[PDB]
């Protein structure tokens, strides 16, 4: 039930996607960040505070980059059992929320990189028939969000998946 303003925060970035938490804060998965660049979104590196670890990257810009947005809450993962929506966007702009039942926050090594993440299982009963790991786009960086009361919170960014157990991992901030 995510509103259009929430989806307007999901942005193509590098080899994947990221998400505007607020006018000044953008989050993504580290491995999709472009290298050898002198700017992100036109802003020089000298003007961006970067905080990243365990495949979670946060950029805090020195000016309002998306002044259209309200600041929302970024949490360091979510409680076990939370049903999150992964806000997957297609290149066409089509919106594909993917429901996931979240498990435990843990450190993991994935493809030789330390990941500070939260695992989850796709919630088949809350996704369109046939919309699963074998059919979604394979991009990273999409945000994991859930509702706290009536308000949406963001708690991670898509980092990994495996068909074994229909399992996904989001990286989480520390
Ligand atoms: C983004 O860059 C991708 C997102 C992958 C995705 O979501 N694809 C859509 C589903 C397709 C079916 C899964 C394809 N698949 C990829 C792998 N295995 N199967 C490789 C990595 N998976 C893995 O090792 O899982 C084991 C696991 C499960 C649960 C908890 C811990 C470990 C995988 O996903 N690798 C991602 C890139 C690496 C790059 C270095 C930093 C960590 C992530 C990947 O392909 N992400
Ligand atoms: Cl919003
Ligand atoms: Cl880019
Ligand atoms: Cl890092």
Q: What is the CATH number of the domain that holds 40?
A: 2.40.10.10
* Whole-number Cα distances in Å, 111 to 21, 52, 105, 106, 108: 28, 18, 18, 16, 10
CA 32 – CA 169 distance, rounded (Å): 15
Method: X-ray
Pick the last residue of a domain from 36, 71, 106. Answer: 71
Q: Are the C-beta atoms of 59 and 48 separated by less than 8 Å?
A: yes
R_g (Cα) of the chain, nearest Å: 15
Catalytic residue among 31, 116, 146, 158: 31
Q: Are the C-beta atoms of 137 and 125 separated by less than 8 Å?
A: no
CB 108 less than 6 A from any atom of ligand 1: yes
* Whole-number Cα distances in Å, 165 to 12, 85, 120, 154, 162: 28, 18, 9, 24, 7
How many degrees, rounded to 5, is the angle at CA 113 between CA 111 and CA 114? 130
CA 84 – CA 99 distance, rounded (Å): 6
Instruction: Using most ligand atoms within 8 A of CB, pick from 110, 116, 130, 163 the residue to mutate for ligand 1.
Output: 110
Nearest ligand, CA of residue 16? 1
Taking the CA of residue 139 as reference, the ligand 1 atom at the shortest distance is: 1
Q: Which domain holds residue 100?
A: 72-174
User: Are residues 35 and 76 part of one domain?
Assistant: no
* Whole-number Cα distances in Å, 124 to 85, 98, 164: 12, 9, 15
Q: What is the resolution of the experimental data for this entry, in Å?
A: 1.2
């Amino acid at each position: 039930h995510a509103p259009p303003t929430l989806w307007s925060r999901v942005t193509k970035f590098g080899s994947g996607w990221g998400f505007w938490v607020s006018p000044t804060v953008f989050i993504t998965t580290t491995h999709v960040v472009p290298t050898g660049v002198k700017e992100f979104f036109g802003e020089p590196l000298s003007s961006i505070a970067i905080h990243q670890a365990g495949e979670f990257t946060q950029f805090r810009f020195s000016k309002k980059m998306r002044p259209d947005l309200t600041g929302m809450v970024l949490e360091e993962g979510c409680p076990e059992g939370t049903v999150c929506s992964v806000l997957i966007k297609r290149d066409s702009g089509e919106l594909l929320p993917l429901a996931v039942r979240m498990g435990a926050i843990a450190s993991m090594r994935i493809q030789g990189r330390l990941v500070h993440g939260q695992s989850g299982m796709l919630l088949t009963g809350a996704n369109a028939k046939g919309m699963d790991l074998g059919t979604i786009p394979g991009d990273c960086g999409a945000p994991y969000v859930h509702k706290r009361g009536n308000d949406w919170v963001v708690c991670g960014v898509h980092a990994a998946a495996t068909k074994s157990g229909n399992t996904v991992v989001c990286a989480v901030q520390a």
